């Protein structure tokens, strides 16, 4: 029909206008700015601790708010909260659905969220008068497998699912208070901003979207990759974020300027980034490649500065403490490893 | 207990108790069989899971002091290249195809029949990088209607290059060999084949024999005897 053809033409010419607008402001490259500063020295880390006890692959970990505790999720149906200083198992929680792909720790420290491949997200209470850990709220309504979930407040959580739609909920009631739609491919990860007012989510369609929490509509769209995007996190400044994709490439995107800041890739690496995280100062990017060992990238020069080669299988999760003294790398060999 | 306080020792005791509980819980689930159930459309997955009944649907049953656990994942409707590595360690892969569904066509395209789709799915499952040495248990379901559909209507619509006697046995053999030719390894993988029976006992016994063979092969490879 004529209406469909004219609508497609209008969409194409808006796409052209947006491309021209994003190309107009791309005047200088990031290489010319950071190539004059002193590169960081080689990062030699050693496995201070070793958290054995899991008997299956490890799919997610999240550092606590006091930078002493962490929680890990395994495929044997186990959620384990450790003590990183003395390798003490503070809590062990059995799950109902053994096919969990994500976990999260509340900023206050009272609740833990877990879910995956079951369309349901469960909240567990840690500070209970009975001394045990029990489920307090189950959120259902997604039609795809859950990919990531992050705590916004003590009564607010945001979850991304495989049904191309994200959802911000209300733990008190249990019904969705905001629904974020507009993604074509499967959404694989989200990350809450430091100010807790916006968030970015990457999808299998090689695109990421930055949303607005208060209103609930897609605000910005970022593209430039070539395959699925498996990891997303903000820069600690809060006005940038790094994605990692399956085509052996990480990219850094700014929120004010919708271009590509830098790309992180190497010819000898043909494997896909499974996790992305930053340091306290934003000078150390720790992307965990699935070539049986992790990696450390200088987040400001795109070159390597160290290798955390201590794992015998795919590394899946990677976290950094709030004060930045420790780094943990979970992998499918069922062994966690805190570095320093 | 040289430098630890009166409370750190109790924390160590609690950690040891948690470790013991994990060890006793991580060995009671290492004697169970993980069968990943697949299929396509109306192959008969519901009928088959009813035949051995007790996001992802988990079924647990028992047969001759052996606990089987099956994962029906037909209700996922998600990109299979993002969640298929979770089933890397499955013992076998049950596969279901109806052989009396060769003349019908899919609603997407008139030319596209409902039999080439099953062959494409089998090719995509029998050549997966995560299932190089994982056995498969092929099923042919609803054979009662196949004879009636073949006695009046020859199967030259689905296989124009097939020169047979338009009988049940020759057509079934041709379908079986065409399905088994999709295998590309022939050494590490061992495709089984079966025709569904009215009684559940035959199918349950066939699955039991197949998983027993897979278990014994894995044990022979484990102890370095082969």
């Amino acid at each position, epitope marked *: 029909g004529s209406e469909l053809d004219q609508l497609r033409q209008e969409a194409e010419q808006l796409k052209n206008q947006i491309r021209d607008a994003r190309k107009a402001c791309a005047d200088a490259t990031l290489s010319q700015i950071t190539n004059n500063i002193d590169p960081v020295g080689r990062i030699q880390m050693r496995t201070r601790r070793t958290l054995r006890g899991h008997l299956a692959k490890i799919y997610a970990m999240h550092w606590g708010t006091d930078s002493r505790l962490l929680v890990s999720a395994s495929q044997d149906g186990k959620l384990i909260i450790w003590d990183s200083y003395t390798t003490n198992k503070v*809590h062990a929680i059995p799950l109902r659905s053994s096919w969990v792909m994500t976990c999260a720790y509340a900023p206050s420290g009272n609740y833990v969220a877990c879910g995956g491949l079951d369309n349901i997200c469960s909240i567990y209470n840690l500070k209970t*008068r009975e001394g045990n850990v029990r489920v307090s709220r189950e959120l259902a309504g997604h039609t795809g497998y859950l990919s990531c979930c992050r705590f916004l407040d003590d009564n607010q959580i945001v979850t991304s699912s495989g049904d191309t739609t994200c959802a911000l909920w209300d733990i008190e009631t249990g019904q969705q208070t905001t629904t974020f739609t507009g993604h074509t491919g499967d959404v694989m990860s989200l990350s809450l901003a430091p100010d807790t007012r916006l968030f970015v989510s990457g999808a299998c369609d090689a695109s990421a979207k930055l949303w607005d929490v208060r209103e609930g509509m897609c605000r910005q769209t970022f593209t430039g990759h070539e395959s699925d995007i498996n990891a997303i996190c903000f820069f600690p400044n809060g006005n940038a974020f790094a994605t990692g994709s399956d085509d052996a490439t990480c990219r850094l995107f700014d929120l004010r300027a919708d271009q590509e800041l830098m790309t992180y890739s190497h010819d000898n690496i043909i494997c896909g980034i499974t996790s992305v995280s930053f340091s306290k100062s934003g000078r150390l990017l720790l992307a965990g490649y699935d070539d049986f060992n992790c990696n450390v990238w200088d987040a400001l020069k795109a070159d390597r500065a160290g290798v955390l080669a201590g794992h015998d299988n795919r590394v899946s999760c990677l976290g950094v403490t709030d004060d930045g003294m420790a780094v943990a790398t979970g992998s499918w060999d069922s062994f966690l490893k805190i570095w320093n | 207990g040289c*430098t630890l*306080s009166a409370e750190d020792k109790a924390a160590v005791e*609690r950690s040891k108790m948690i470790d013991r509980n994990l060890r006793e819980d991580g060995e009671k689930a290492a004697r169970e069989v993980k069968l990943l159930l697949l299929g396509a459309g109306e192959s008969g997955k519901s009928t088959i899971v009813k035949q051995m009944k007790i996001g992802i649907v988990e079924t647990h049953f028992t047969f001759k002091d052996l606990h089987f656990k099956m994962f029906d994942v037909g209700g996922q409707r998600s990109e299979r290249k993002k969640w298929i590595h979770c089933f890397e360690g499955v013992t076998a892969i049950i596969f279901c195809v109806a052989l009396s569904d060769y003349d019908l066509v899919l609603a997407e395209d008139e030319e596209m029949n409902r039999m080439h789709e099953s062959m494409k799915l089998f090719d995509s499952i029998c050549n997966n990088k995560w299932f190089t040495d994982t056995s498969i248990i092929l099923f042919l379901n609803k054979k009662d209607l196949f004879e009636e559909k073949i006695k009046k209507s020859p199967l030259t619509i689905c296989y124009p290059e097939y020169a047979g006697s338009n009988t049940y046995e020759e057509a079934a053999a041709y379908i079986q060999c065409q399905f088994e030719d999709l295998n590309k390894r022939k050494d590490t993988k061992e495709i089984y084949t079966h025709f569904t029976c009215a009684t559940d006992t035959k199918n349950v016994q066939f699955v039991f024999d197949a998983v027993t063979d897979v278990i014994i092969k894995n044990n022979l490879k484990d102890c370095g005897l082969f």
Partner: single-chain antibody
Amino acid sequence: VQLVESGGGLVQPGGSRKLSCSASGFAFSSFGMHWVRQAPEKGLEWVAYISSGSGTIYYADTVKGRFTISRDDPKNTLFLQMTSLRSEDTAMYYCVRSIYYYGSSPFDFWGQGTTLTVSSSDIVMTQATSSVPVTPGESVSISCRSSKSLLHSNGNTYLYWFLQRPGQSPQLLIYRMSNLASGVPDRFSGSGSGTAFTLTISRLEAEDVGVYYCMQHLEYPLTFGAGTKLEL
């Protein structure tokens, strides 16, 4: 959450008795168990301790080798048996609950207590003050004295400020010398470095009148101090 204790009474100088406490409303199978003895019109003192899963068992040196503590996990019950009762063994007993992990609040529930009457090296804990008259609306400060350094190598400071009221069982106010318990107002406070410690109340009310105690947990035994009384 509740603990019910029974087994006390009037006994002859020769006879063996057992005190049994039953726990309901929580997971007894993961809580360390204590006993506390309090002489009538006097202070209180520790008795024994059993850890989770019947791992280790301790005793007080006063009657060491004569008490027998046993824990029944399926029924959530604890027993303490005593055989050759002397004259000093007339007192009333609490059975506190405790759990030990990083961030927990040990000595949180003190049960109720049951009385038993008999018919006829260690850090010392002492409080010089014994009574202070006070009118509601003004701050009160009490001091507690030790004979060593309570700060362990890890960084903790084991002193538990707790409160007893007439006819009402003791309750936890301050654990590890700095943090407040749950279910109490923000009126109470406590902080002390080294050897001298202090407990402080901002605005008195009619409920705060009673005896206040400090207790130390650096090592064993668990020596209690002399309580300080606040009357209206």
